[PDB]
Ligand binder design. Structure first.
Ligand SMILES: O=c1ccn([C@@H]2O[C@H](COP(=O)(O)OP(=O)(O)O[C@H]3O[C@H](CO)[C@@H](O)[C@H](O)[C@H]3O)[C@@H](O)[C@H]2O)c(=O)[nH]1
Ligand SMILES: O=c1ccn([C@@H]2O[C@H](COP(=O)(O)OP(=O)(O)O[C@H]3O[C@H](CO)[C@@H](O)[C@H](O)[C@H]3O)[C@@H](O)[C@H]2O)c(=O)[nH]1
Ligand SMILES: [Mn+2]
Ligand SMILES: [Mn+2]
Lengths: 282, 282
């Protein structure tokens, strides 16, 4: 009933059916992590039993953690890849977008799956539920999750999409950190910086491929780190810079400033520079 | 230290000085009200002692309340004006913007002051603190308040202004419902619909007059009705439609849709139609 292929109830496929449907295609899972020692182990544990089966490869993309994220991830049996190790020839920029872009060179799966590592008790069927439409359907090359926080999504992204890309008004969680896509697509797209990356991939895929190439799946309920408003303001600023750039609208490039007392002025970084398609780095 | 004339500490002027400084100029106060029976009395009480003094006129602009807002406001000694009564020749549209636009025909003050009527225990010095820069300074024609909720402001408006009108990045509460301005300015500007009006007046004033004509004043702490996220999403959508329109960016005109389960789809209204300057209705 939506213009977007949408699985509403717990998808029917089993691990075995999906594993059969792979048909030579490989699957890589990437957990980007910046200081998530408190949750990373449960997130890895919820996925590592699929390894050597449905999943051929699982990595943690360590985006410069200074806490005990790496040693706990290792202790959970996960391969940990720094931004440096993933693509040593290129100096590292900050932001999640960078990490996701770099994870493309540290993985070799025909299908790449992303899962945020700050999720509190993720369901072990997240990955299957996410690769469902890619494996069985035809035409699908991007799968976003949806779920029943949510402030930047409900106040910035979905209303802006309503404003500038109404065709995507039916995407329920455009910023979801849990999503999957073909390597062919991901290596063809540029990667927006910082927190601009999701909204960047959505608009670019659609612009390049239309809604038929996009699916979304219900994963139930999502719980994650509740961040302070100033950080969300910064994130919201970058989401806006990337969305505006994809719509052909010039963004000033000026970072958001916040005040909190004569007074204490702080400016957050914002970037208008995308990383190119990983294809060009062959 | 900001490019915007900013009074940070409780402004020094007294009621008497300000009353002296009027010099023939009149002051109208407008409280727009849509179903605020629980708070309207305290808001009127905090202002009515200035009437026949500093304030020459106080009205409640009733924007179609079906609760006991009108009878309580009357019982507090306030003149209550319906949208119909304010400008009977023109059929009524919904939204706050409409109410504020209409209040221009029901008032006759050289200076018009706006105060939201959902404020919990407002300080009786709000109006003086707001008319301070208009009465004493020269050049000022718009005064916004600022204060230590705030989600649409911190995630949508200030970051968008950072994106498209960085000169206003130093405006602390662009959506504040408490603000004052000259009749000359207000009757010269168009009024954006619904919740687009504040952000519409800010961008238009600045575009027409630059920062020097704009001031902002600290009123301390603001407390008001906490609204559910779907309503804030709708509000945020209209703020975006108006901001995009003022920046020369085409808005789709498609209202934001929300889902909440096979499912229950609702679309909120959005309007791309401004009311013209009240001047043209002479
Ligand atoms: O520089 C960074 C920043 C974040 N992350 C990781 O990215 C994930 C998401 O970051 P988070 O701070 O939890 O973002 P959210 O506020 O939850 O943002 C939501 O909305 C964002 C905008 O699209 C998405 O990027 C997020 O994935 C999504 O969870 C977390 O695992 C982080 O550890 C990094 O690896 N590197
Ligand atoms: O159709 C309407 C809607 C609202 N109001 C009144 O306007 C005021 C503000 O509305 P509110 O629902 O409290 O808005 P907020 O979510 O608090 O929005 C904040 O941000 C908005 C966007 O600029 C401003 O319009 C508001 O004044 C400001 O308080 C309240 O007194 C309402 O009674 C009306 O008179 N008519
Ligand atoms: Mn998170
Ligand atoms: Mn309010």
């Amino acid at each position: 009933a939506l213009p977007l292929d949408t699985t509403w109830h717990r998808p029917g496929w089993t691990i075995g059916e999906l594993e059969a449907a792979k048909a030579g295609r490989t699957i890589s899972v990437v957990l980007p992590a910046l200081n998530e020692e408190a949750t990373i182990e449960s997130v890895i544990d919820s996925i590592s039993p699929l390894v050597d089966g449905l999943v051929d490869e699982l990595i943690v993309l360590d985006s410069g953690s200074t806490d005990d994220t790496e040693i706990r991830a290792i202790a959970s049996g996960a391969r940990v890849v720094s931004r440096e190790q993933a693509l040593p020839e290129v100096p590292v920029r900050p932001g999640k977008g960078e990490a996701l872009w770099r994870s493309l060179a540290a993985t070799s799966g025909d299908i790449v799956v992303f899962i945020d590592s700050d999720l509190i008790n993720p369901h072990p069927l997240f990955v299957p539920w996410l690769v469902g439409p890619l494996l069985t359907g035809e035409g699908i090359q991007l799968v976003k999750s949806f779920y029943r926080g949510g402030r930047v999504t409900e106040l910035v992204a979905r209303p802006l999409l309503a404003a500038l890309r109404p065709e995507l008004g039916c995407v329920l969680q455009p910023l979801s950190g849990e999503y999957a896509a073909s390597r062919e697509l991901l290596t063809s797209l540029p990667f927006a910086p910082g927190y601009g990356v999701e909204i960047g991939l959505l608009i670019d895929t659609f612009d390049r491929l239309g809604l038929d190439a996009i699916a979304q799946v219900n994963l139930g309920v999502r719980a994650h780190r509740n961040r302070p408003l100033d950080e969300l303001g910064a994130m919201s600023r970058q989401v806006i810079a990337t969305l505006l750039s994809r719509c052909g609208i010039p963004d000033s490039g000026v970072g958001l400033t916040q005040f909190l007392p004569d007074y204490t002025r702080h400016t957050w970084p914002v970037s208008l520079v995308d990383r190119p398609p990983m294809k060009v780095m062959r």
